[PDB]
Amino acid sequence: AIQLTQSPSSLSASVGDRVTITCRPSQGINWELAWYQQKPGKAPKLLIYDASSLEQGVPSRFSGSGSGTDFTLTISSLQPEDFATYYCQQFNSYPLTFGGGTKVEIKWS
Amino acid sequence: AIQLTQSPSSLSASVGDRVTITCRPSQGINWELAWYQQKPGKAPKLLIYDASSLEQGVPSRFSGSGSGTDFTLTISSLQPEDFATYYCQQFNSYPLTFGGGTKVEIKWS
Amino acid sequence: EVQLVESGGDLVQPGGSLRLSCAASGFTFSSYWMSWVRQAPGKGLEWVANIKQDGSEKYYVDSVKGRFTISRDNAKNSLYLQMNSLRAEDTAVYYCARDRGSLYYWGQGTLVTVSS
Amino acid sequence: EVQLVESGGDLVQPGGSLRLSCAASGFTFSSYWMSWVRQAPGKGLEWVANIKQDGSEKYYVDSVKGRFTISRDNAKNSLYLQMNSLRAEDTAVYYCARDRGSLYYWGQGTLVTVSS
Amino acid sequence: RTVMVNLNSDYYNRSTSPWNLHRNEDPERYPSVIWEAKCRHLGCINADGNVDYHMNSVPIQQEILVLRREPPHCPNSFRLEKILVSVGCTCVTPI
Amino acid sequence: RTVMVNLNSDYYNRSTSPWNLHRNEDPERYPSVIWEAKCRHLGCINADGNVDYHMNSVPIQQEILVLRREPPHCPNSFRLEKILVSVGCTCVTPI
Secondary structure, three states, rough: OOOOOOOOOOEEEEEOEEEEEEEOOOOOOOOOOOEEOOOOOOOOOOEEEOOOOOOOOOOOOEEEOOOOOOEEEEHHHHHHHHOOEEEEEEOOOOOOOOOOEEEEEEEEO | OOOOEEEEEEEEOOOOEEEEEEEEEEEOOOOOEEEEEEEOOOOOOOEEEEOOOOOOOOOEEEEOOOOOOEEEEEEOOOHHHOOOEEEEEEEEEOOEEEEEOOOEOOOOO | OOOEEEEOEOOOOOOOOOEEEEEOOOOOOOOOOOEEEEEEOOOOOOEEHHHHHOOOOOOOOOOOOOEEEEEEEEEOEEEEEEEEEOOOOEEEEEEEEOOOOOOOOEEEOOOEEEEO | OOOOEEEOOOOOOOOOOEEEEEEOOOOOOOOOOOOEEEEEEOOOOOEEEEEEOOOOOOEEEEOOOOEEEEEEEEOOOEEEEEEEEOOOOOOOOEEEEOOOHHHOEEEOOOEEOOOO | OOEEEEEEHHHHHOOOOOOEEEEEOOEEOOOOOEEEEEEEEOOEEEEOEEEOOOEEEEEEEEEEEEEEEEEOOOEEEEEHHHEEEEEEEEEEOOO | OOOOOOOOOOOHHOOOOOOEEEEEEOOOEEEEEEEEEEEEOOOOEEEOOEEEEEEEEEEEEEEEEEEEEOOOOOOOEEEEEEEEEEEEEEEEEOO
């Protein structure tokens, strides 16, 4: 299948920071990538479709980008309500696959 | 330049008829063609743009079609208010050119 | 509101069977494609199966090809998952979602437990 | 309503000169491209010249290249046509139109007569 | 015949002509997700907050360009298509 | 990076939130002609037929796909772009 390599698998950050998560598929994809947010005990929320397009309701402080083999999910100004696990998923070909996830954890002081 | 060959140069028809005017450019064009209507003593009216798209105000009884070297302007049900000269024009490259026109005349009884 | 409610998930010994049931409401269930994605305890998401509007086309991940069986009852507003010869790897939370490529409408999930 | 009003057109002997004037109103004249298309007595349309928003780019048909001069006064809301060494073929109705490729907004026209 | 192509609000509720948004997905299309507007009421919401049947909710349509995997499922080739989507609703007086 | 691509209402006036349509042309773009909606009034037209400043005319925007001649003026090659067009206007209560 098309394997999705997510980078990093975990990361510490503080409120107001700029988080940049990268998704790199095994082969080449046009735009056929999606990003999600998952908070403990909840089903995942869809953030970005077609690698760059913001979904209904999703706040402006979210960007999606890149093509082919380099995809980027970016939170410009981190909010408390933004610490979760972020998944990337291709819809280029079956079987549809998910990335391993990236933990946007809290960096303690 | 890109020369536009319009067919026929004149044609007789009656109210309710289906007129099919053809425009054939000298070379190959993608969609970069426009159609007009001109009535005596008036400036031309733009009917269809991008070979197939109906302009603002233009009635439904108008179709534009074809690609490359075969373009078609079609009046499905002819109206009295539709007897005029019809021009086709390319916007593929300079110099912008017009077809010779087609007279949609009245066929007398 | 669109509503997707899973059920069926329970503790079942390996080799055994179980039928999941996603109860759809809030939309013309008959017009949209459905899916099943799983989340194993403390693990990432894994796409499992999807089924066409009527039920003519169906697609899977190879780890469940021939073992799992996806189905729909468009009159009842139900999506199913008849799983068989259940393994350790098959212990996950089974979420059903509407559409095929980008899933916006998700259910709360159902835990299928498969152990000794 | 968008309004395009031509003027200047008159009987001028061959070799002579004349300045056309298209008076624009009903739009930000400064933001849109303009054009001049001609119609010779009993003949088809012939694209003549077009000019960019500011006045940096200009394009022509080769039958008027070097003889005709297109210009704009964005402060005045005016498009011009300074024609020189006027020929028999140059006797037409000069229409000015807004935009470059597909012209929707047309003026009523101005007859330029060039004969003995 | 073919061409080379490189690659680069709470209005629905607050409206007098309110609308519902229905998600439309196809992984085989670009955009893959289009939300379509469907007018909630036949009339219009007034000052009092009820349906005035003197007016009418009308959807505002738009002919949009979409790409599609041609041959079907072929991930590298595409066909350009024109679909008629409804973006929102407006309140109009009859004619 | 590149892909092969083959090729295939008086609402503005009658509205409570009326709009003006401004033609936008580029021969270098597909569609070459887009008409854009610009809200006529700040408020909304009422039963009496005047501007009620209690309400507001808001344009309904849509991210549309457009093609463009890339390299500039090259008639055979294109680049896909996303532009934000306003299709019409709706009448909303403030927030």
